[model samples]
Target: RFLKVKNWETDVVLTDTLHLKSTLETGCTEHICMGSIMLPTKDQLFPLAKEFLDQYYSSIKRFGSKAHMDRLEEVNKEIESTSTYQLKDTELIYGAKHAWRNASRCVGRIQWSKLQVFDARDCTTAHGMFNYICNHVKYATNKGNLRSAITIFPQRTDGKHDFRVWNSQLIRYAGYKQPDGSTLGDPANVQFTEICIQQGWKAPRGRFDVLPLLLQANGNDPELFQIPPELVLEVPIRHPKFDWFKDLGLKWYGLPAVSNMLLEIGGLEFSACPFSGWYMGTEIGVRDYCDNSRYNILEEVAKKMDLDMRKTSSLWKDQALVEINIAVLYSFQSDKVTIVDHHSATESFIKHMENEYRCRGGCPADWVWIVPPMSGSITPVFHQEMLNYRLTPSFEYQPDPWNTHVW
Candidate 1:
């Protein structure tokens, strides 16, 4: 599976920081997380420290300075004795950008080099996280400008204290299981919503309600913060053909800024690193809206379009899916939001494939996610074979918080 995660290969020289790239366009090839999630304990600290320090050495060795060399040695000494290790501001920022460049599941890695890294590692309070994240949402959304950015809180240390942003994203809908058995909004966040309620945080009244963030510091109870509406950009879903689709009152955020994934640099894990790039249409249309577990609206959409469902030959599902994806692209564009259709995304990915192989010897790719959800076989990437390989400085999925006290 580690072999399957598999594009971010690079050197550590500071001069190389000018050109950085990453790939995570392999979205659900979760098998990558199989054994890599082991949080390195004290024993692994030196190796993590040395890997980063040696990377620092790459930047300083050619510069001809003993001061930088002395500082590098200083950090290595601190690593062996301290419970928490410090990373050079240069390495931390540069490494964060490299991490974005290394994400194999993201289609938008072409912009990985331009990622904005905000180091908030010094802040240890839940309130501090809210202020920084509120700003993260504000700037990254940029009123739909959608800049790729990541704000990293401190990494896990001593296996005791860690920071976690509980919402699956900076913004997500609350799911309510109404008394009549029908569910409203994103069913994915129902358990999180209930937890928020138990904590005495007031919630909205419907399926379309955007849940506030839940922040936990040092494995303590989470605190909720209602995101101001203006900071959250939303697109109202409407169909191209059927006007009735708008009447369903469905909508979603403009950006897909994931807030909970752990960011691993060398072997160090930053549990609360929220980062995002622009949205791809199928992510919202084919997966979020169509998946049976999330919004589960495909049949309702097909029914409204009056597509015949009784016959497999009708291709009604495909027709409905196409319209839905088109609607998502149209709505985002109509609102002046940045979005990439599947065709363009695949084309961009193919370019990334060629560039990586040209520069790094081979491209790390997953055939499943790189192919479009709707027309999987048609894309050139679908016909081509690819290998999944592990590359350091990558975003990784952690176990869901409710199931474990790890957060």
Candidate 2:
């Protein structure tokens, strides 16, 4: 189901998660393929707890968690006695924040401590899930002044899975695979887009079609809850200099609220937690709007620039990319959507590393993701070495039920 390349240093894909171990040393360089991700098995859970419980206890105590602090030994005593575990609300909140801090792939980890955790564990119905998520979207969106937040649902315990959010993000366009082998909207969402239609979702017909928030609760069939178009704040990307850029009709949501990834706190897995962060300008400018598989808007953007299309020496693509990113930075600013430019973000990451060294023993970062897509070498992350080891009380990529499991 997976393939490994011979050269670890050069062949790794930035966006792909399951890659080489980045050259681990048993004695010499031995590359290991991190096989498909899964829920941390029972054997790994206790050690994960062993590695993380200190922070688990430390994080709670630092926050003045007296009740949780009182029960700390009881929780610890049961670590070996049973595989299942429970954390206090305060622990859950702090655990989610640490999970973000320990998120190696996220460039926005500098804002890890700022994440607001919403405990939606009591929600057990599809209607309740939709309502809570709506609130999560609205509150975090903050009317275009985006804030980082995560709404945590019930965790997997006692072999009962209570809830799940099917969408990758809170807001995303529905992609329609067309007759000509071209996509009408976001190609990424087409599979899920088709899934929605198959499940009787009222599919919208447009390039920027917003998909409904599809949710499942208590092993029931998935339900579609339409996101109010007004609630989802969007930035219509426009270049500072070129008004023609506005005519391309490109827009992106204010928040990148990821819904599908599991939020692992100690040994517990909350599969339905949706978390958000304000974008780095490059994510929109470089990857979302410009990537070949995504919006694929670069060629048209270059056409408007009137650059020599035939010559790579002309740096037509590079020129187009710079403007595209400039447009994103300009649009988000104009729309009051919070974003950090690449240079500032890189500086923040270095500061994060400095703070981590003084506070925690070390910071684990994935170099491939810490660096921005454009001008990667120029960023401080490119120069620094990072550890990519898995940390418990972490966020993880679990297998999608549609792809690998039955509900």
Candidate 3:
């Protein structure tokens, strides 16, 4: 029941598993659908180690060959001696790209094959992790021309001494709790910002202040490292038609580097691997600016556009949403930053799905996630049925380092 795509006419089953433990715990059955419970828990791996190696060699067209057989034997012996084995640099690179390609939630997987992998497996300290991460931001940002990339830290062996990046994203605005209990800056990052303050960071108490990184290496208490201002490329958001939009003081970082996700490759997990890609305009425009839980700038924009907010029939929110998205696209383009609009992004995903089916016979997709946040019915993905499944050499969510109770 966990492997098959439910509620579809032609069930395309995914050949995959922590996801297994998570779904089963939720009591998922053929008669009931729990597709909404998307967040997953971690599961241990060992026997599946050889299985992933088989998949890896097959990916390189070297399955069952002398080298493939030799690698399996080598891994088996090493695992027997130390209970865990290390991956070669080339294998690590391949595994990272495959993880992105196998990401079920990402609409930007069309560029998965072109991702740049950085091996930071040799990094041993939290400060060292900061250096690699900063370089990752620099490379991915490319002075506003974004690039897809991932920096792989040392893989977890005992799970007790794992390296982890605490922030959800590499660049996120700090959130401060005011005296009135309102949040300043990105509300999504309020907890992380509090953690940073607890870790001895001086709170700037300003909207749009970039949060310092909370990096944990070798299971140590996470440390705070302020990102260099020069390394961050931010575009000041403005509208093409509305001259007053510039007065809103909206700005966003160029890189969308997610740091909290765990990278699983060949049964090995990197708790500190942070991957990045360019953003879709709506990610900032619709979700960041308009979400009631987030910045919630819709009412302000609506008033600027002179829309009637008193009546729900006026669709004031919708009008503001389109303009804000337009502003995001126009601002990024004017600043020479790389950003794709929802329409083009969804169309590209359609081509990506076709290519995946042609090459691999099945593509795992979640329609709820694949469809753009705004104008869902207008997008191609909304009308299309999709299957969500887990695949090996994939990225998975891990329990937060602070929440893991190891400290």
Candidate 4:
């Protein structure tokens, strides 16, 4: 019954009753960890559709009104006759933003209400999807300043009728496997890169070559479309103190557009809704640049710093980690790009948690993800205990189209 959220820096404690009751089932228990669950749980679409309409009306303070009842009746009749229904543009917009708000793993929920939604539901071909994607990249990049946006493609009508984006992220560097078992570019994307190459993509073998999009229309074989170079915005990583840091030739794309996440609104599942948001500093600095499996630039960075790398006790990795993070923040700031440092981001998230609890009596949070990758203990979230649960309309992990391919 008791939940204590403490701020060690200010000696403040927030005590409240844990609201364990939720309308949705999270499918998690003491012995079961569903955090890695990829597929959407089973639900009766007719009832789920009605429930979502109820939520939408309630959100707008017009529940049970004449117009609300009419809309509900219309959806009920449409679904009962055809097994599915369409959402009005206004409903789609609201649901998309609501999905972001309900995303439990996100640390940037403070800006959830401010997303730009682009409806690409009418796109009937892979070529049209590419056109929409390029426009999304242009708008979200905003030159150097990034903006949060999502372009929702057609929803999955059945098991085989799904529109999908094969690329995990809208913009990702290509990875080419070297002859000596080494990887050139981003190692994380080697598998997808291989697929792209097999589909006639000319391998530039550059460290930061943005991979072309693999778009699948209605479960068909994916068609590759290269992202136009002019629309891609990248920031060069440079440290304020170390001029040589720029010599590493490190740079990252401005838009962190996740292309593969499934956007679930009510009971309706959109298989190809690509969303973009500004990056938190640690995502690029600590995870992308320093992770051993990723670019793995830590040893090189430490060597430049003249650190004693032979001993783990020397904290060479930690020192190099902080400097790289500093370079990321400094570079993005100097370039007039949108980026949030861990301190400010976590502080804003704490405030978002408070606001969520006040509004709904509970806030679903995943502690493992909410804590920053670097300097975990220093952040307030590391000290806070959280309950993770699932709610909808929400963004969810769907099986990769390639893994479950028939065509």
Candidate 5:
């Protein structure tokens, strides 16, 4: 009913250019009001004619096939048999008129067009019905109601799913479903089991520290497994709760006592210890060398006495020098650590600046210019630079301490 009325209003108001422009400017209400005044409701008999066509199409789709072509022929005979006025009223005249107008509006708006006129003799199926509505019926002028038109036609039912309709048209239409008798599951059902094992020191109840004792079969071939002396020592020292030699029944060579050390961190159920052959004395030289280097570095730093440099010089100057040296030393230690910490701090500062600036659109170019006497807005340039920085990939470079051959 709504579709019919909307269609009529469209044709009455939108057919003329001046009317269209005016409607476009003032909107639908003014257009409808003007239409009602200009066109008399009774004289516009097209609405009643359209209603009759709609009923005809509906009946055709509903009962046309079962009675063969007899049902539609009967309807036509009955229509011709009845008085024109009575036929018009019974045909739902108002709906037809409105639909016609709506279709006209759709045509004007470039929604759809009739390519070929409807011919009842050969036309069949929903698409054919659509053509009848679009080309033959007075209200069937546009494709805007193509969906509704298609619905009025009987659907083809077979074992195969309507792939074309499902993929192209039916999927888009509301309340459409696949045809009956289609296979529900062509692919076999699948099942999966995801096993997740978290093997680590659980806090609050489990051991505070874990000492992984790796007893190598040979002590001489310690170099075969790159096990640092400190790591080996720290494991036993840190985790005194578990005696590797006594509790786990594992014997250690070269290193007398162990210190807290984690063999593996943050992954997998078990740690593959390469130092499993250390007890057999396979690589004793490598172990001694590592231990010696560790002790020397530790001893060298320990020997340096804590000087009262701050007392000798100004507190500010001495502290500043110390801070500068510390900063330089930090950079030398690990670029990855430095970059991460610096990047985090810089990002936070940039975020704060962005909030402060609050400028929309693209950031100003002048703000980004690095020339002396930086002018324009700094925030805009900063924002842009921040964006560029985000686009650029950030990577950390870590120099291998083991490889001393600096190029």
Candidate 6:
């Protein structure tokens, strides 16, 4: 029976585990859908990581501005002079020397508080060491004066997954609002698209009950209510000179920034009936009471059993015998088989051995064992020996002989 509304909160939170177990036992339900265990990475973390990377990169560019060209030249000279011996070490040694010299000067001339502002260590703790380096390139391209202006003579060769270049492009291309009230090119969108390319997009699963509750807590507006079928798909900005509202039409209405701004301005509000809340609350309350009553009945029965069993032998002293009864009502005829002590060595273990033997080529060509026995003498012994040596048998003949056999 479906639970009543009054008992919702108690039923959902308190009796959820018990209910799930009952369904498994009494209903003969073998499969139960379990939700995801791992929580999503926090939304705030991404933006903060991006900001830290931006600042760290800007600091590096400011400190190394004058030495940029000179350091590059020095690295080139060392590579040329030592050809084989110093070529690999040249760039790394120059960067380290530059950092060390800057650190010494920073200690003498820079204020302690201000010096902390440029500290890579603090940024590394929040953002991560590898991500800190990637952010530096992003800051140089986006905010640095000289570094941002220098265009490559010949485009540097790069692998597809280069983090520095990727992050730099992300910063440069991050979509924001334009003066004409249009969306800018979004870097995050590109990343999402790339992920979708690698792994196909899946349809959203499970019910969204919480969404209605949230909408109810905030007041509703009829204009804000939109049917899913009426939702307009977004269009790409094809031309540089195109106006967003004029070109995109209804599609631009659903943009996060656009929708959020409209809500802020009091032009839009969520459209859900206030009565929906009261109705849901009543239903949930009934559900809670029903669940509590069910549990109370079960506990009373258990107490009675304990009293009766204690007269024969102290109930606590003897091992508890638990009997689970399962029934399934089906319109169609079905054959049901239940194994006693399913996981016991005498039952499941022998079946496992038989399966192994069949898989490894022990069974005859014409026949295959469906419910293989666990206690077969030769099979179990042979399986143990093969497992010890990490050896597997290969079948000499195919099982489906009728399909391949010449009459």
* Candidate 6 Cα outliers beyond 4 Å, as residue runs: 1-77, 81-130, 133-164, 167-192, 196-407
On the 0 to 100 scale, the lDDT of residue 290 in model 2 is 84
Tens-digit lDDT string for candidate 3 (1-407): 33332323334333322244222133256898777776631123445667778877988899999999999898887777777789988788888888888777889989988989999989999999999998999999888888899999888877678899998889999988789888888999888788788879998889999999989998788889989999999999999999999999999888888998988776788888998999999999999999999999999889888888999898898999999999999999998999999999988987787677657765667677888899998877776566666777788887777778455
lDDT, model 5, position 220: 14
Which residue pairs in model 2 clash with each other? none
lDDT of each: 0.74, 0.77, 0.83, 0.88, 0.21, 0.21
Give the runs in model 4 whose Cα sits over 4 Å from its true position. Answer: 1-27, 32-43
Ranking by lDDT: 4, 3, 2, 1, 5, 6
TM-score of 3: 0.92
Model 1, span 1-407: residue lDDT tens:
12222222322111121123232232335465432223315566666665655555665563336765676567667766785567767778778876666655566766767888889988778999999998888888888878988999988886567788888888788888889897888888888889888878787768778888888887777788888888889999886767787897878899788998988875688999988778999999998898889898878888988889999799988888888888899889889888998888877776776666556555555465566778976665665556554465667888777677642
* Cα-based RMSD of candidate 5: 34.4
Q: Which tens-of-lDDT digit does each residue in 80-194 have in candidate 2?
A: 5776667778778878998898787787777999989999988889899999998999999898888889998888765445477888888899999888888999988898998
Q: Which one is best on lDDT?
A: 4
Tens-place lDDT per residue, model 5, 1-407, is: 01111112123211111122111121125337332221112223333333334445554464335543553444445435542222223222222222222221111111112222122323333344333322322222121121112112111122121101111111110111125532111111000000000113121211211122111111111011112233322111111222221232222222221111111110100111110101111112112111332111112222232334434453443332333223322332222111112223333433432332342211111112211111213322223331111000001122211121111
- Residue 270 in model 5: lDDT: 10
- The C-alpha stretches of model 2 lying farther than 4 A from their native spots are 1-51, 60-73, 76-83, 158-162, 405-407
Comparison by TM-score, 1 against 4, better one: 4
Worst 10 residues of 2 by lDDT: 19-28
- The candidate with the higher TM-score, 3 or 4, is 4
- Residue ranges of candidate 1 with Cα displaced over 4 Å: 1-42, 55-72
Task: Give per-residue CA lDDT, model 4, range 77-192, as digits (tens).
Answer: 88878888899999999999988987878999999999999999999999999999999999999987788999999988876878999999999999888897898999999999
All models, RMSD in angstroms: 6.1, 6.6, 3.9, 2.4, 34.4, 31.2
**Model 2 TM-score?**
0.86
Positional deviation of residue 52's Cα in model 6 after best superposition, in angstroms: 30
